[PDB]
Structure formats: structure tokens, C-alpha cells
Design a protein around this nucleic acid. Sequence first.
RNA 1: GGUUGGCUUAGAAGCAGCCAUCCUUUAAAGAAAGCGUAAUAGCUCACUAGUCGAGUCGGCCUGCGCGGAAGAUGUAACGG
RNA 2: CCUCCUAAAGAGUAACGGAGGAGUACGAAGGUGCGCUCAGAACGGUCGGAAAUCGUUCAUAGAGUAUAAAGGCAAAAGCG
RNA 3: CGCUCAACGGAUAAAAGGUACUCUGGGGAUAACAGGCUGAUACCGCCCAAGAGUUCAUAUCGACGGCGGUGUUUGGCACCUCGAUGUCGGCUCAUCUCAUCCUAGGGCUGAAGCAGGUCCUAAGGGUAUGGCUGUUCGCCAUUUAAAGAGGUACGCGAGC
RNA 4: GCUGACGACCAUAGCACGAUGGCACCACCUGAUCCCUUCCCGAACUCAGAAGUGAAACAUCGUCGCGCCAAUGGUAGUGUGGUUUCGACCAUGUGAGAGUAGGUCAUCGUCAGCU
RNA 5: UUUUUUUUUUUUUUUUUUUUUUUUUUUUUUUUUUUUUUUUUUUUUUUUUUUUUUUUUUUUUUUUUUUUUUUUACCA
RNA 6: UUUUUU
RNA 7: GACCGCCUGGGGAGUACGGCCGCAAGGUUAAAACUCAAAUGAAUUGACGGGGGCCCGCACAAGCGGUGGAGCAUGUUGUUUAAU
RNA 8: AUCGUAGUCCGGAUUGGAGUCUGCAACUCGACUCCAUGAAGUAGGAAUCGCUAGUAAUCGCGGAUCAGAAUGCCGCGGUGAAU
RNA 9: GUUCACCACGGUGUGGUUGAUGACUGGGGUGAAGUCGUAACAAGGUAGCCGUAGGGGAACCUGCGGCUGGAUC
Lengths: 362, 84
Amino acid sequence: KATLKSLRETKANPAVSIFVKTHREHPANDQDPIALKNQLKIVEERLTNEFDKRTATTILDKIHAETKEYNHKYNLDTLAIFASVDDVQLIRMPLDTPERVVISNRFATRDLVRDMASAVHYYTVVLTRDKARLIEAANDRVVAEFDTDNAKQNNMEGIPFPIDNNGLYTTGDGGSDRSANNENSYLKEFFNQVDKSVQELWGEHKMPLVIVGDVRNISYYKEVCDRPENIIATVSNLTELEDGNAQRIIDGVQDAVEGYRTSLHEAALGEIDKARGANALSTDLQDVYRAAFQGAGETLYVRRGYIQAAKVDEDAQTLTMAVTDDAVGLIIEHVINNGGKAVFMPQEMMSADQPIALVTRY
Amino acid sequence: AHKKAAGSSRNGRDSNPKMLGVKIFGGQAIVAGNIIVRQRGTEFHAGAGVGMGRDHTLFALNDGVVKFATKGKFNRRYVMVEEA
RNA sequence: GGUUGGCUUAGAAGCAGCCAUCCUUUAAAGAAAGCGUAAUAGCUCACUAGUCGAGUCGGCCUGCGCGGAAGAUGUAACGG
RNA sequence: CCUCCUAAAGAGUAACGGAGGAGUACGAAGGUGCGCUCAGAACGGUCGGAAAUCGUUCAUAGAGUAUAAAGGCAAAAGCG
RNA sequence: CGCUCAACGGAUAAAAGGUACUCUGGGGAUAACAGGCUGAUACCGCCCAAGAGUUCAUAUCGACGGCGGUGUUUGGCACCUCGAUGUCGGCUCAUCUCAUCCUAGGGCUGAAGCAGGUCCUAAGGGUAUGGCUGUUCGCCAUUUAAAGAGGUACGCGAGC
RNA sequence: GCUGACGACCAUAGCACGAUGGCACCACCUGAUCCCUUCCCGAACUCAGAAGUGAAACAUCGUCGCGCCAAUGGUAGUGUGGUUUCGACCAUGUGAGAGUAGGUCAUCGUCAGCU
RNA sequence: UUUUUUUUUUUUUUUUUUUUUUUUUUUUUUUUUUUUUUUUUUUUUUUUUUUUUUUUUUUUUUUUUUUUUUUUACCA
RNA sequence: UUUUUU
RNA sequence: GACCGCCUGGGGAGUACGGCCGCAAGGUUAAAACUCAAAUGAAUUGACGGGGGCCCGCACAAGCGGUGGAGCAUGUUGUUUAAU
RNA sequence: AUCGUAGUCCGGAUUGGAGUCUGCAACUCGACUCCAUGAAGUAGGAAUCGCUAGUAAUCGCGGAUCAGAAUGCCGCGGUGAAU
RNA sequence: GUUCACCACGGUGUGGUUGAUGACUGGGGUGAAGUCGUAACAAGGUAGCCGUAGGGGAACCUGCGGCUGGAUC
């Protein structure tokens, strides 16, 4: 059970979630073993205090049997351990979380939820005066390259990718002269055909696209695009457009992808304001928890690191200030479980005085 | 040539005509040696009064009138030269 | 009126969707043809009774019409 | 140069039209007389099977024809 | 008897190139420009309505498909011109279209207001200056009510 | 009346199923010395014969199960002249294929033999 | 685009003539070594890019596609 | 002649 | 005893920068930050040497018979198991 | 005496059947006996081991443990080298 | 009062010195059971080292001269 679709459904007791700040490079990862030891120390002490020593010992030996072969030279940003009385699942995440221990019925999966909510799937259109390429990219990896062996190009009414610019002027025949200065018009029409192929492929999937290429090529394409509202980013400082591989292109578009995610988080503020005006936004922790538990909330807006402990009972729907170690984690779990959405807004865009908001369904 | 479509498929050959078919039709006068049918195989068979060459050419063995008929158990087309 | 049909779903109460179209007071009233609600609520409809009083309703085919119908010197797409 | 189609039921008929072959082979794979009949399927049978050879029953040819294709082929033009 | 004389009616037994240093005779019989025909492609519009739009096809957008209009991109053709129709851009000077960029009048709106979004009417006026590059364009800086899309031999070299 | 040989014709003549035939004829049949056969085999071909049987084959007869043949009418196409919205339509002349009703268990000639 | 060159074991390379798959490096197991190299013994190992086609039999013969190299893609 | 390392 | 030269932990470093010299290669004069609690000399006892000398042991050499290949016994690994 | 170089009159694993003992109890999982079967194996690659005389090599015989269950262990003698 | 002389402010130009910064780049140091080798210490398996020159992924190798701070002789 290494996935979010299994952690939320393994409802053990006690369910122990341990988070360790790890490092990818040396000697920063030199203190990763010590951090792991300290987190397991507090885990053992709390488990003995809250439960029996036998159930602390079985859990800790199970964690140790899996962490004894851990290589700390291959650590990502966070090491998450999900331990039970019977199973232990440890996963490495490129997300940064604050080191903590959560002992509850369910596994603390708000970091997995945030990582999945930050997911961006997009197209990369790589332009050149000589060719066009199309890549499908998920977050920071290439999904596919759109070459000859693909299903999405089987039944195509346009030129399939990779598209060569075999214009009559490029080969030197066809009925045109260089003294006519038609080259810009030729580039515009070639990019128009490229956009035709892009739209044909996009109609079956409908994801935002990033335009990569020279500034002039991007210009011509933007003026020629049939659906220019779906364009979310343009990068003109990416190198080796014709020979570099898809992973290299996706590596080079990551700054623009992050800027796009930031723009989405900025846009979320307007919807929060609309809910506040319509009287459908709850910002108190008690009200937010009650609405989330009774399934009244459609969107949650957390401040990306707003952990809070409280006394929560699901009988009178009360939340008194400190117990549950992550009351915000419980709110996120209820919102997700009742078919809602969770948005983890950045700190510089959501105030620390009001770090949680809930757009309710009524 | 934008979609890579137009390409090599070389077949511009054909043989010369052979000028086959029926030369003398039914009921016509014919003199011995006159060719009646030029054919590939026995599309028509030589009945009485007409012979067949090595290329299945049907020719008149004697003077008379050309007759076409379907006859025999195979329902074969036969050409005859009747002494009329 | 059973009844918020059962399921599903945060909620699914005639009316997101999936599976039946049953019964009762009936002159009549769909386990509902629409609007509406987060869901209920609410407003209509189908249907029935009353008023009035004579013709009326909806499909099919056929003829001729209407819209669809924006361009560059000047009407400028009956030669006038 | 040959075969089919284009080619409009005699012949012929074009395109940088659509499809394929040839630049050989054979003293028998020629002549004649005589004789014979194929492919497949099912059933039975040592190795032996989906398929070898053997036996039986259906079988106008679904085979063969030195070779491309077309037209032919039981009097076989097929096979000894 | 001796030919891949295979460019197969076989020019000689015997044979490759370059020319922006060029030249002659011809051709609009035949290409490059611009016109014409055409409209595949393009652009614009419309039809259906799966879906997105928290609910809700049709505020807004419109998958799979369908039907047109324009001449307007990329093309196709080779009709005009080879006893010559000067090419791109700039400058100057324009003229028209409307598929309207601003200003004017509206309907709908997921139109509280301020701002918009769409579509209808509307062509009277108006509709930047610069940096880069030969550029048209494009990007960028700073503006503006706005910095429209086009046709005019991609207007205009017997005007530069 | 039946049988055999050779033909016309080439499914309305065929297939399938059932019945009848052994005095002539035919067919199986007997044998393999001889003629002649077998890439082995008297299977077939061949010869010498009549102990048996019409079993098979064959011939005839019966039928409609299959096949095959097949109208009438209409439709499609089409030559000529005209029109056209390029689909077609009109006049005139032709006129299928498929399908339907229906038909079919052939019809003849020469010669020989038994009755 | 076009004309040529080809695509085979883990890799990089040999075939091939219609009747078959190759070295080398690996890889696996042994052995030597205190232990690893090196070294020495054993082994394993190919839809012969794919797809139609011909043949009794095709990696091989035809045809197509697809990667690979090259070489060209000119005149206004 | 050819003995690398820990 | 006279006069002169030089040193002041190991690195960084006889390096950088600036002068001067040089055709050049470079030479010469000559820092700092930073970093480490060492870096060194001589001798001692061992151990080791693809150093030397002397010597022993089935260590080799000289031989005899095996193990490694087969089946089986037994032990171990690995695997498999509820456990092995 | 016989076998006469053969996968055999070599080898005796594996399997089928029938039994005897010990033991409460022989399926997992005993040892022997009998009959039948008759497997690999024809001298063993790289490599590697023991032995200097009553030794190696070979041949049998005892004992401990032990109800039963040695090809192991611990001993005993016989024959008896090569270098 | 005017005028001249001296002169502070302030101005112009052109240099010097020096602080902080700067894409990139050179070496130094620190940090893990990383990769490549094995140059030195024994004659370290080619004695090592000094100057110099050439060469090389890297320790380094090679030539010329010098030293012993070289074992075996």
C-alpha cells in the first residue's frame, strides 16, 4: 500500500504516520539517520504513553525491519512512514512537510493529497522553422512523445507529429521566389498547419499547452492559434528544440509550469471572495469542521502548512482548541471523502491570521 | 508536399494489342484458309470444316458458309464451315 | 394517500443517474412533462369536474413562397 | 517485349493511370502409340503427429499445366 | 556466328562537365511577378448537441460529425503578357469594404455596483511614438478612447 | 414389349429415394494352361469358360425432396429527338437481371437379337 | 522528399547460396584467492524491425511500412 | 617475463 | 671573535597581486583569507619486503592412492514451508 | 570349474509384491529378509587432497550411543607396497 | 560708489589609488563504505628525488645533467 488510494482505506488502529525531513545531496543527508532516529524515539514514547508497550514494540520492530535497509543517499525531500500493528509502508516524496508524528485511526495523507492536487497535465508544442514536436507531460515527466508508433495519431486528418516543414520554399521548387519575401507568410501558414494538428490531438484529451520555441516562432503561432485561450505558458529560452529529448524539454518548461500553478492559486482568491460575498464561506475551525463532516463544503483552502491539534468528537460536532494531532488533516479528509476539493494555497497568498477557509455547498 | 503522401509506385507498362476475336461471323461466305477466330485457348472449338492452328486459330479447311453453334455435352461454342 | 418507490449519493424527497411502473380515495391525478432547491420547499403540467357553446386537432404528401444570405471605384445578382 | 484493367459487349484507343511479369528453359519438358486421373475432407491403420506411406468412401478439378497473368484444358493441353 | 546497339527503327568504331564573364535565334507553344479560372487547404459563418461551466447542453465554450460564404492563406491550372506587365520593405499620397478596434444604440448574461463577456444594429469621424532587425511581421518600452481586419497590380519607383 | 451397339441432343435429359428385370442380352461370375497384363498385384488389361447370382452395376418404371428450366406484369438500363434543378424527366423505339406463378423424373434416329 | 546502405543474442559485429545461425564482450555456474580483480574451466543465448507474398521449406526470394546512416533537395 | 586492490 | 645571510607550526605557497628582469619558457622580490592540531628530526622495539644469509616441516620434488564426473549416505547453503 | 570384455554372470540405485523383528505405535519416517525390476556408471574438466613403513593401499572384526535405527565416530587385527 | 589685485564656495576635464559587486573561469580546502587506476614508502616490484624540456585521462612517463636523503653488491 504505497498509494493514496490505499492509505486512506487502510483504517488501522493504532495508525502511525511519521514524517522525516530528508535531503537529496551530501552532506545535507548526513543528518537524515539522526532525524529518523529522533522521530522513531518520539513515536515509541507516545505509543507507549497512549497504548500498551507490547503494541508499541511490535510497531517499532516492524518499522525497524523496513528502515534497516534504507539508503539515505537516495532520500527525497520527505520520508513518510505509515506503520500499523501488521503492516509498514514507507514512501519518499519530493514534497516538503514539517516533521511530525500522527497517531490516529487513519493515516495522515494530507501531504499526498497536496501532491496530487498540485498535479498539472499538459501538452508541449515545440516549434522550429524546420519542424514541430508534441509532447504530453505530467507534472515533471514526459507521458509520451507523439511519434509514428502512437494510437492518438492513427486516425488523423492532419499531418502527424513530428511535423517536418516541407514547404515548397524550403525545398526550392513550387512556384515562389526569395525576392518576393514570402518567408514570414510561409512560416505563418506552416504554424497554422501545426496548430491544426495540435487542435486535432487536443480535442480527444483537452489539456492546456505550453508553447516552446524562438520568440518569433511563438509570436507567429500565437497569432495563428485556433484556440489561443488554452495556451498557459510560452518558453523561449529552452535549448536544443530539434535534437534534445522530451525529458529535456519538460525539464526546461518547469519554471513556466510552476508559474502557472502560482497563477491558479492567485485565481482561487477570487472564488474565495465570491463565496465570502455570497455568504457561503466558513473560516472558523469549528464551523469548517462541522460543515466538512456533514458534507456541506465543496472547496477547502488550507494555508500549506497549517497544522493544528484540537479535541474533536463526532457526536456533538464540537472542536475545542488544544486530542487529534491534525484537526486540519481531519477536515481535509472529510472534505475529500464527501466529494469535495482541497486547495493548498501558498503562504504569501493566504494570510496567516485566517489560514483555513471553506467554500460550502449551501 | 506537406503530408508525406505522394511517392513511388512505378507501373506504367502494358503490352501491345493482339487484335484477337471473331474475323468471319455466322452466315458469311468463306474460302479455304480464311481465319475465322483468333483466340487464346479454345474459346471456340473447330467443328466440321474448320481446323485449329498451334495458337488456337480457327481457319476454314474448305469453302462454304461459316456457322456458329453450341453443341456437345460440355456446351462448347463450335464454329463450322457448311458446304453452302 | 402508501411514499422521501428501491438503489445510488454529501444530498438524490416526481424531477443528477441506475432498476420496476405497483396499489389505494377516486370524477382525476404520472413512483411525474417542465421550472425550482444543496436537498426539501414552492410554481406549473398531464389528468378530472364545472362555465361557455360548434366545429376542432395533429401527422403525411404536393405546388409556390420566408429565413439561413457579409466585400472591397458606383446602383451593380431582370441589359435598362 | 508479355498479361490484366482503364477500353464505353467486334478491332483499336491515352496519361509521370492502377496492378504484375520477360531478356529464359528443355534432346526431353519434342514426335508418336498406349495407358492413367487430381486437390482436399472423413474413417481405419507401427513408429507417425495437424500433415509422410497404406486401405476405404465422397470429390468437373476446389489440383496440375517449367514460369507472370489472362484465356483455355477430359479426345485432357494435366500424369506415366 | 559476333550487339544490356536496354535511349531496345539501332546518328560515330570512338565522347564528360562549367559559365554569376557570357552570347545568338526563338517562345507567353513554357516557368519566376501580378491578373484570370478553381476553392482542395485556409479564414469566416451556420446545423446537431457529448461534454465543461459546483447544479445547469445552449451566460460563456462547444467533442464526434454535417452544411455553407468569402477569395483571404497555402496550393492546383497554364488562359494573358518573354519585339520587357520592374521585386520586398520604407517614404509620400491615398481610396474602398465591413467580418467594428474606439466612440453611438441595444438584447441576453454565471448583468449587485464599477468593470466586463457574447451577440444584434452601426462605416460619421477617429484609430500612437519609439528600441531591435532590410524587414512586412514579431517581440519589447511607454502611451491612447482606441492602437481594427482587409481590398485596391500582396494600391502607389514615367512620385521619392 | 424388352435388351445391346452407335448417334442426335446435352439437365424440362441431372441427382436423390423406392420397385421390377435374368427365358435372349448385359453384368457380375469361374480359372489362370495358353495370348496378353502388374514400376508388386489376373485389381484393371487379356485369354479359356459356363457352377452360381441379379447382391452390386446396369436398364426400366414411379415421384417434386434437391437441382434444372420458367412466364405474365412491373422495374433497371438503353438508341434517337427534346428538356433538365445534372438526380433525372418527356416523346418514340427497345427492354433485362433478380424474383413470382408455373413446368420437368426427357425426346428422337439407324442396326441387331429374344418375345 | 529522392537515390543508395542497411536493421539478427546483453552490446557491437559475421552469415545465408531457400534447406542452418555466428565471433567478441558480456551473463550464469565452477575453480584459483584471506577476500575481490585478473585468470582458468563450464554453460545459456537469437519471431534474424515489422508486414503482406512465393516456395514443401525464407533471416535469405518479392512487396510494404518502420528505425538507421549517408547523398541530394536547384532557377527565378 | 607477467603479484591490482583491501 | 669579526662581518654578512637566513629561520620562527603544517598546509594554502615560493602561490596570488604589484614591480623588475627575460624573445619566450619563465626567473626574482613576495602576501592574504582560509584550514588543520598537528606536521617534523633522531633513535628504539616489533612487523613486513616481488632485501640478504642459514635452517626445518608430506612444504615442494620423487612416488602410491584418491577428491572433482555416477548412484547413494550424511552435513551445510539456498529455496520451500505452519514449522522446516 | 565357469564367465571371455559385454553396460555383461559388472554395477545394485529405484520401483512392485510378500514377510520378520523392536516398539503403545514403522503413513509421514525404522532396519533387515525373500522374489521381481535392473538406473546412472566403461575411470571422471578447471582444479585439488592424504601418505615416508608394518606406513599408504586393501580386507574383514568389535564397541559407545542404543527398545529398534552407521556408509559416521572410536578401536582391532590380516595382507602389505612405491618413492 | 566704481574698478583692479588676492581669495573661499562652486564648476569643467583628464588621470591615479582603493572598497563592494560581476556572467564565466583557475587553483585551494572540507564532506560519506563513489568512479579510474596504483605514483610513493621494501630494490614498493622501472631506486627515489632536484632542475629542465617534451608528452600523457590521472597519479605520472620519457630525455639531458645532478644528488644519495639508494637495497643488493
